[PDB]
């Protein structure tokens, strides 16, 4: 089962203040209207792939979801990350740790740190060794699917760890609904209000109207015809041709010569 | 460390005095890319990394951006856009040993070339021939790492060199490493020549209403001129208005 990414998965791309401006940037963002996968830890929490940045969200009441694991094989061979809220405070550790494939909560080393009613929305990416975590916490009136609407996520964590992440797992307490989507290298026009809060965005490759909006640097397009891009037929295969010569030439012979 | 498995140490949250290395006159090379030596003390960096390893003297020339060779391609590759300094010196009286120092290793065999700044410490037997090696040395099956065997009697090209590659993150993000500078006090509504963590210009500092989110350090204009800063010592935001000018 899947849900519709109704403008969710957008965050502040840098640490530079901007306001009252439409600014064009490039980053790993959840594509607008992408297919986000449903998961329920009821009656499983499969280990999921981390492609090139991942989008997460969860619906909550009693903090049933309390953490996550990011890594590769998770059997003490490379560096991997464990983040747990612990129903106390946050502890983060990265090492060559051996994991259970069924870790749970009840109801060699590189880094260590010690610190429905609503929805937690957050994203992760890892750039040049920096694990970057962005999030927001808002109320919901929806009890299964994800809420619609736009508000950008803020950075919370930015850590130079060098963690190898190809896979991950959600950590829940047991005696349970969450979502996973993926980020893409897309161009966006971001709308910053007078306080520098991103209140809207255009996914520049969603469709031809959004393409026009990015071209014109506007969220409003006037009646008319705009030239926004070029159509190009792509090659489908390559062709390589050289004469079918089986002869080799005496290159070795000018280096291994008896006399010069 | 051996070059095949070079070490990395992170430098952060400090005052970095680079004159101690630069003016020591104790290095065979101190080549900087993107920055000039001695200007480092006026700069701020986000993180600073120091990679370290031992190579032989003829190979010092391989530790460079855009460069190729057995180390540049199988042990330690620098990117074409590298910003940093390659500092190295002779260790013939430290690392070389009588009978040969065989502790230092380099990779001679690899299936493909390395990406900038990665490591490969696999001991998988290299499949030079057509018959699968299955983990065992033999004809056309090789252990991938070789020792240097450094001796005090070797000529310079084969003497060991200690190399430190210092990488500089000159990013917009807040600095954690700054040179040995002293601060002065702030003024408001006056025209000053300012320097905020390496960000310079001339302008008039005023109290700002541009609340910056907790992670934001400065504001920016259409032309990339900055227009607001978070002061490095006090958490207030200043606006930067260019000093008045006009035609005469």
């Amino acid at each position: 089962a899947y849900t519709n990414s109704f403008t969710r998965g957008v965050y502040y791309p840098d640490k530079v203040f901007r306001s009252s401006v439409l600014h064009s940037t490039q980053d790993l963002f959840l594509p607008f209207f992408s297919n986000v996968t449903w998961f329920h830890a009821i009656h499983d929490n499969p280990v999921l792939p981390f492609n090139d940045g991942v989008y997460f969200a969860s619906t909550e009441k009693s903090n049933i979801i309390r953490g996550w694991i990011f890594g590769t094989t998770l059997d003490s061979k490379t560096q991997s990350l464990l983040i747990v809220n612990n129903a106390t405070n946050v502890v983060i550790k990265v090492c060559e740790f051996q994991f259970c494939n069924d870790p749970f909560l009840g109801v060699n080393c590189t880094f260590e740190y010690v610190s429905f009613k609503n929805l937690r929305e957050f994203v992760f990416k890892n750039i040049d060794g920096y694990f970057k975590i962005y999030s927001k916490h808002t109320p919901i009136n929806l009890v299964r699917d994800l809420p619609q609407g736009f508000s950008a996520l803020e950075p919370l964590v930015d850590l130079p760890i060098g963690i190898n992440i190809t896979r991950f797992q959600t950590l829940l307490a047991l005696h349970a609904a969450y979502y996973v989507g993926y980020l893409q290298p897309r161009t966006f026009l971001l709308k910053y209000n007078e306080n520098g809060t991103i209140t809207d965005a255009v996914d520049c490759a969603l469709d031809p109207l959004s393409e026009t909006k990015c071209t014109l640097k506007s969220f409003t397009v006037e009646k008319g015809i705009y030239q926004t891009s070029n159509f190009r037929v792509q090659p489908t295969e390559s062709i390589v041709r050289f004469p079918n010569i089986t002869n080799l030439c005496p290159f070795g012979e000018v280096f291994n010569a008896t006399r010069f | 460390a051996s070059v095949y498995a070079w070490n990395r140490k992170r430098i952060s949250n400090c005052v970095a005095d680079y004159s101690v290395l630069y003016n020591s006159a104790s290095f065979s090379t101190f080549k900087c890319y993107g920055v000039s030596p001695t200007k480092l003390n006026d700069l701020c960096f986000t993180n600073v990394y120091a990679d370290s390893f031992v190579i032989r003297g003829d190979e010092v020339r391989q530790i460079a951006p855009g460069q190729t060779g057995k180390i540049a391609d199988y042990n330690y590759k620098l990117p074409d856009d590298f910003t940093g300094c390659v500092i190295a010196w002779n260790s013939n009286n430290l690392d070389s040993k009588v009978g040969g120092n065989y502790n230092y290793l380099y990779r001679l065999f690899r299936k493909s070339n390395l990406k900038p700044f990665e490591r490969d410490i696999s001991t998988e037997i290299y499949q030079a021939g057509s018959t699968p090696c299955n983990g065992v040395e033999g004809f056309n099956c090789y252990f991938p790492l070789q020792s240097y065997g450094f001796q005090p009697t070797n000529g310079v090209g084969y003497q060991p060199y200690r190399v430190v590659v210092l990488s500089f993150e000159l990013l917009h993000a807040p600095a954690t490493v700054c040179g040995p500078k002293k601060s002065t006090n702030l003024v408001k509504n006056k025209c000053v020549n300012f320097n905020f963590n390496g960000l310079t210009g001339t302008g008039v500092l005023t109290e700002s209403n541009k609340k910056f989110l907790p992670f934001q350090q400065f504001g920016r204009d259409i032309a990339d001129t900055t227009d607001a800063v978070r002061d490095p010592q006090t958490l207030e935001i200043l606006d930067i208005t260019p000093c008045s000018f006009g035609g005469v």
Epitope: - | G99, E137, F143, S147, Y158
Partner: nanobody, 118 residues
Framework: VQLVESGGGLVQAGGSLRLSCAAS????????MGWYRQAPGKERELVAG????????YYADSVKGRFTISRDNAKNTVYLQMNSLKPEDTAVYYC????????????WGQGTQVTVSS
């Protein structure tokens, strides 16, 4: 950079002959080392080799039953023992790393001549 060989000489087929060589750490520290040979009428081939770690040995099949390869990591030397030499084994024997380049710049020592008579 420096390779030397010795232990050659003229013998009658049968008996035994032990070759020896040495190398500077630059070559001695390589993953594996062994002996190569050349003779009028035939190109250079690897006869036998021994690794640096584990003392793993291997031999060309054609010499497997009469040649023994060994090394000494304290002495920085390599040896090749021939038991019951044949006329076909007349060759100049050389010390070198098991992998080697065909380039003229890949250093070889002078080699030592082994001659075997009828």
């Amino acid at each position: 950079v420096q390779l030397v060989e010795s232990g050659g000489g003229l013998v009658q087929a049968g008996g035994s002959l032990r070759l020896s060589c040495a190398a500077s750490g630059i070559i001695f520290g390589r993953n594996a080392m062994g002996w190569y040979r050349q003779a009028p009428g035939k190109e250079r081939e690897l006869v036998a080799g021994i690794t640096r770690r584990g003392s793993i040995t291997y031999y060309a099949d054609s010499v497997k039953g009469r040649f023994t390869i060994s090394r000494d990591n304290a002495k920085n030397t390599v040896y090749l023992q021939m038991n019951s030499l044949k006329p076909e084994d007349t060759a100049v024997y050389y010390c070198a790393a098991d992998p080697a380049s065909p380039a003229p710049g890949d250093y070889w020592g002078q080699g030592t001549q082994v001659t075997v008579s009828s």
